[PDB]
Structures are given as structure tokens and as C-alpha cells.
Amino acid sequence: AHPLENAWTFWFDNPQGKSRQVAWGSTIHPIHTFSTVEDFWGLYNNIHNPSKLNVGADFHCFKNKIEPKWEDPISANGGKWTISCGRGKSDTFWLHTLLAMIGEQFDFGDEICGAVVSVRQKQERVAIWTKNAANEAAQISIGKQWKEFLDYKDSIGFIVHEDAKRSDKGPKNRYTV
């Protein structure tokens, strides 16, 4: 078996139609933990790809003990890069995102906390979470390489978690790569 540098945990949360504004993530839960390339596949192969997910469901893959929540102390000062695409057109983007992450392919690897693919009504988004948004140099690098890894050519934005918390209005991208 080929061991990974870091352990990872798959997370999942299917609201089942319930609103996401009330008691958010009260059901988010871990699914599987893996620490080798082979184990990663065995899990990935027997797990619903993004395209098979119902509206409202969220699939996450975080490093070590980090949880898919803004309130997590590890992501307290972080943010995230997002890519949006049509319904059922994120299977590959998500896959490559996972491989690049577990592969420790990023120049500022420490920053990487995990990834989350969100399935919605008329769109699907894949987002990679980072530790320090105040570090513009690192984030710009993470963003560019991520697009490079997924061979994405459209501009993307980085949204600080503190701005995402804004329940009053949509968050404005801090950076764009």
C-alpha cells in the first residue's frame, strides 16, 4: 500500500429537503478515514459521486481532524476557492481536487484544510478550504495551482469565511485567480 502524508476523512450531509438556514449541519457526519492511495480508491469507488447527489447535499474531504465548519479553530481565519458548474458536471473536478489534495501537490500545502463539493438546484460547486486568508501570496498560489490541476480556465474567487458568515448579504470575493 502507498501511504499518504496526511490522513483524510470523508464527510457527508444530506438535508433531505430540509432548509439549510435552520440548525445548519446538525446532521453533518464523518463517513470514512483513509491514509493510503489504495484505501482512498476503495472508498471513492463505493461512494456516491457528486452527480448522484440530491439537491442540498454536501460531500466533504478534510485533512486529519479538521471538520467542515467555519467555526473550526483551524479554519478560524481561513477562506475558500470556488468553482461553479452545471448539474452533474463536477465529478471530474471533484476527483482531481481530491487527488491533488491527498497528493500534497500544493506549494503552500499547510494551508489546505480540505475540499467540499456542493450540489444545488441549478448548479454544483467544488470548493477548497484554506487556513490563512490574510496570506494573499499563498492563497493566490493555491488558487492558480488548483485551476492548473483541474485544467480550469475560468476566473475563480476566494471568499473569506468571516464574510461568508454574513447572513445579511452575499460575500464579496477577496481575491481572484
Ligand X SMILES: C[n+]1cn([C@@H]2O[C@H](COP(=O)(O)OP(=O)(O)O)[C@@H](O)[C@H]2O)c2nc(N)[nH]c(=O)c21
Per-residue x/- track, 90-129, ligand X (CB under 6 A): ----------------------------x-x---------
DSSP at 75:
G
Binding mask 37-66 for ligand X (x = CB under 6 A): ------------------------------
Q: Which listed residue (122, 151, 167, 169) binds ligand X by CB under 6 A?
A: 167
- DSSP secondary structure letters along 133-164: TT-HHHHHHHHHHHHHHHT--S--EEEEHHHH
89 forms part of the interface with ligand X (CB under 6 A):
no
Residue 145 neighbours by CB under 8 Å, 6+ apart: 100, 105, 106, 107
**71 labelled as ligand-binding?**
yes
Produce one character per residue of 12-37: b if its CB has 16 or more CB atoms within 10 Å, e if not. bbbbeeeeeeeeeeeebeeebebeee
Residue type, 148: E
Extract the C-alpha cell encoding 128. 477548497
21 is in an annotated binding site: yes
**Annotated binding-site residue? 168:** yes
Contact predicate 133/161, CB 8 Å: yes
User: Is 39 annotated among the ligand-binding residues?
Assistant: no
Cα-based distances in Å from 122 to 20, 55, 57, 154:
16, 9, 13, 19
Nearer to ligand X by Cβ, of 7 and 28: the residue is 28
Dist. CA 77–CA 116, nearest whole Å = 18
Site string for ligand X, 5-24 (x = CB under 6 A): ---------------xx--x
Instruction: Say if residue 55 carries a ligand binding annotation.
Output: no
In the set 69, 144, 147, 174, which binds ligand X (CB under 6 A)?
69
User: Smallest distance, Å, CB 7 to ligand X?
Assistant: 21
- Please report, in range form, the residues annotated as the binding site for mRNA: 20-25, 52, 70-71, 120-125, 165-169
User: Where does this chain bind ligand X (CB under 6 A)?
Assistant: 20-21, 24, 69-71, 118, 120, 167
